[PDB]
Amino acid sequence: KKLMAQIFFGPTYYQRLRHMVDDKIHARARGPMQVLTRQPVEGRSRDGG
Amino acid sequence: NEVFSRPEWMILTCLPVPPPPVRPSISFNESQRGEDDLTFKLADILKANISLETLE
DNA sequence: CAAGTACTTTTTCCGGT
RNA sequence: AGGA
DNA sequence: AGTACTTG
Numbered sequence: 167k168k169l170m171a172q173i174f175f176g177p178t179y180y181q182r183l184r185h186m187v188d189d190k191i192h193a194r195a196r197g198p199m200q201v202l203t204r205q206p207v208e209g210r211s212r213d214g215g
Numbered sequence: 216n217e218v219f220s221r222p223e224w225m226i227l228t229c230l231p232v233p234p235p236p237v238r239p240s241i242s243f244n245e246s247q248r249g250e251d252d253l254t255f256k257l258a259d260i261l262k263a264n265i266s267l268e269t270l271e
Numbered sequence: 272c273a274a275g276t277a278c279t280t281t282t283t284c285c286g287g288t
Numbered sequence: 289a290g291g292a
Numbered sequence: 293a294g295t296a297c298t299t300g
């Protein structure tokens with residue numbers, strides 16, 4: 167069915183940015199602890215809390 | 216306070232040496248120390264103390 | 272005595288010199 | 289050095 | 293950018 171509205175349709179230059187989900191997604195539930203403080207480590211890389 | 220804090224106790228005579236959990240050695244490899252800053256400053260105190268003792 | 276000085280808490284949570 |  | 297503090 168025809169849309170009751172008319173859409174502003176035309177080409178526009180779009181850039182792909184360095185922020186991709188799978189490079190940001192993180193979950194932790196028990197894992198490495200620091201030594202001094204004996205608290206969770208820091209960073210997605212290090213698998214921190 | 217005569218029980219918990221007398222003025223004389225603001226002067227240090229005998230110094231408490233905290234244990235490893237406080238100043239852990241970040242022990243890289245199998246043959247490498249990696250001693251804490253507190254562990255080094257404590258040895259400095261010791262050295263400074265030993266000199267004074269013998270000197271007097 | 273005052274000016275000009277240092278410190279300080281100076282927004283939060285998420286790649287690697 | 290970057291992210292909301 | 294401010295405040296008690298500090299030093300001239």
Ligand SMILES: Nc1ncnc2c1ncn2[C@@H]1O[C@H](COP(=O)(O)CP(=O)(O)OP(=O)(O)O)[C@@H](O)[C@H]1O
Pocket residue numbers: 282283292
């Ligand atoms: N330095 C910072 N600290 C904390 N929160 C911040 C921040 N910078 C941005 N934000 C958060 O991110 C939100 C979005 O800010 P922006 O990303 O610049 C788009 P906007 O200013 O809200 O205008 P828009 O909705 O018309 O596009 C803010 O309202 C704020 O909660």
